[model samples]
Target: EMIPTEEALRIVFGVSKRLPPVIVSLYEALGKVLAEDIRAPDPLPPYPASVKDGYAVVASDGPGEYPVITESRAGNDGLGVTVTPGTVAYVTTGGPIPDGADAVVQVEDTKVIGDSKRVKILIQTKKGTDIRRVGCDIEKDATVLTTGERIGASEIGLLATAGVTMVKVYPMPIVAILSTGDELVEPTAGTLGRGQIRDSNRAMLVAAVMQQQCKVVDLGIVRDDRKELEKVLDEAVSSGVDIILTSGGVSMGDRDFVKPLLEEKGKVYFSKVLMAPGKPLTFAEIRAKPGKTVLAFGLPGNPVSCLVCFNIFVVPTIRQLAGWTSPHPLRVRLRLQEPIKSDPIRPEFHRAIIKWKDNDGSGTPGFVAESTGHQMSSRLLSMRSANALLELPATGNVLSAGSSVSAIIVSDISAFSID
Candidate 1:
């Protein structure tokens, strides 16, 4: 029986819990979810630092010519100079403000004298102006990052600045990718015969899995032999593969033995979902050990169906296993730029190009979606450069232009063409 997508996800990810955390160096931690809270050991810019390359002087000194005492580079220049009433210290950007200097006048607002011994301040400096005070960016003992946070470039910078050389992050999910079909041939192995098709789903799913920052083991293409499939399953059990993704043999065909095999050795949850291009999606859990279980996704054989199901089903499962707080990509609301018709029986997840617009050429900048034409399951090119999936239900699927439709963002919106 076909189950609702929400019900399928709850049943699938409900069993897919977060993996144990591991310690890793900062260099290897990017995109990994943090397992523990990170606190700042010292304040950012531990000292008062100048935000501009200019003269540091007492704010009450006001606008006037002042004798240059000494120059301060980013590091200590050993001048040990103090900014008294008529003396100003030339400080570079990020240079430590000299003692007794409460203000900084930017170089643009100051002019050097003929002998370079002094400079004329064009504007009066104010206290705390052009200065980054201690703890302004980050305070000592402050929580810089909390658990379940994904480390990005900014997080790396924060960790490094906070003197964190190593971090504890959740283990990356390892997925085993397999394609099974008696009529399937590996493109790299040999030339395709009349009845055989190259295994495109393996390569496509591998890329998709890697895009989620998960590791993958290419199990290669296997024939429809049940014994051969069992051998791979044994290897997967031995190698601790967290997720097993198979492309074919999950349906009710006479040779489709994937679901039957899964039921024989493991537990197969819902068999089908009420969706187009991905109706035959299968999810299961194989108990590998006492406390360990491997999640498996039997995606449809068609290339587009595999990708759609991988995005809609598999990605969230892997993300949850990898300890991401929000395991699913966010869905957005965008007006349809053109009319779209959906399937009469099943919900259609049509690939689309979502972009920023002026809401019918005016007002606030809104999003608009244009369909990638000819969304046949066999024609996978419909996903080329697709950034979002326009969701349409089975009933009343006729959507007119300018109607607000929900879309699951598949790609970075910044990559979307602004024009």
Candidate 2:
């Protein structure tokens, strides 16, 4: 029997575990989750630094003509030099301040004379002006990043500033993709016969797996033979893959071998989910070795259903297993430009184009959903053209125009226009 989407998710998430940890250099850590908390070894800047090309002086000296006592560049220290009551030290941006100086006045606000060796105050200056004190940006031993945080460009820059060159991160999961059915022909060479269709599911599955930053091991197409399927399953199980993703042969059909093989070699959870276009999805776990198991997902044969199930179930599971804190897709509300209805017992995901409308006359853009023609699971062209999925609940009621609806944007096509 089909199960609710929420219930199915909970079941899959409950069995998920974090992927194995790996040590990664800073150069390759982008988009990978940190496996441990990173604390700053020392305060950023390490000392009081100058913010601009200026002169460092004693704050109590006030604005006046001060003799140039010394010069402080970025890497040099003017330790014994004193910017006493009537003197100032020439400094540049990132230059270290002298021991007795308490402020930095920008060079633009000062006059340089006598071959630029001496400077005079051009405007009134306040204490601590243009001076970046030590630890002002980052404190010593402070936690900069916590475990499970995805490292991005900003994080990498911050870590560099903190003097961190390496980090522990979860290894990328390995997904083994298998396509089944004797009637499926290779898209590269063969022409389809009466009941044969190109195996587009492999391309879709490979793309989906790549989206999760996981490595894919393509086992190629498997015919619907019990013995051949068993052999392939045994080989995949022995390959030390994190998960096995198969398309087709899970439904209760005479040619179906996935369910029977799964039952014989693993634990099958739910053979179906309570959703339209993807009801016959299957999830299982195979004991590959002692104290080790691998996840297996059986996706529907139709291209659309295969892609949808991967996003709804496989993606979240893989993300969680890769140490991500929140693996679910973000949900947002949008206005419907037209009405939509679905069966009361099955929630349907309609392929739609999300557009921005300024209908309220306030000059602000509001979201609008327009369904793409043909919502069939077998229609690969429709799936390829759609940028978002307008989720219609199982209410069996016609949604009026401008009614609020939820949508999950599946591609960058919508974001490029909306954002």
Best by TM-score: 2
Clashing pairs in 1: none
* TM of each candidate vs. truth: 0.92, 0.94
Clashing pairs in 2: none
Which segments of candidate 1 are over 4 A away from where they belong? 78-80, 114-116, 189-191, 360-365
319-352: candidate 1 lDDT, tens digit per residue = 8988988998889888888999877888889899
Against the unseen true structure, what C-alpha lDDT does each candidate score?
A: 0.86, 0.83
Q: lDDT tens string, model 2, 4-76?
A: 9889899899987888888999977888889988988898778888898989988787777778888898665
Positional deviation of 282 in candidate 2, in angstroms? 0.3
Worst 10 residues of 1 by lDDT: 356-365
Candidate 2 — what's its lDDT? 0.83
